[PDB]
Amino acid sequence: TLPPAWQPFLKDHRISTFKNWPFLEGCACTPERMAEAGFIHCPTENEPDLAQCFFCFKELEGWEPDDDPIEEHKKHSSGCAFLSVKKQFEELTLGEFLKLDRERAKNKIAKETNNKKKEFEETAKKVRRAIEQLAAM
């Protein structure tokens, strides 16, 4: 019985996001191992195997059955602090937990601002080009 916003810190919540995950028993990147590694399932029509770390917000697709989710998390987002968490959720102190939730919020913000920066720069390219075209004739 925990607030929706904190659910993703719980392994069982993360497992439960995996609706129609294609890699089941026999495979290394099962729901159990994806969740153990921090991922939740964020499928689209386009990107049906899409997964995201709840903590650092890295988004990975193109999963292969032999992929070890933890190694993939390490390779693709090595600064992620969730990877450092050795203790079970209930063995954390509230101070530790609050320190973690603050870093998560900062990660979320950083991701959102990184997105805004790329969208802006793309708009800037369109405006620039259009002005250049006009000055030509």
Binding site: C29, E47, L50, K58, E59, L60, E61, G62, W63, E64, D67, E72, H76
Partner: peptide, 5 residues
């Protein structure tokens, strides 16, 4: 697995 783009 690869990053999204």
């Amino acid at each position: 697995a690869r990053t999204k783009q």
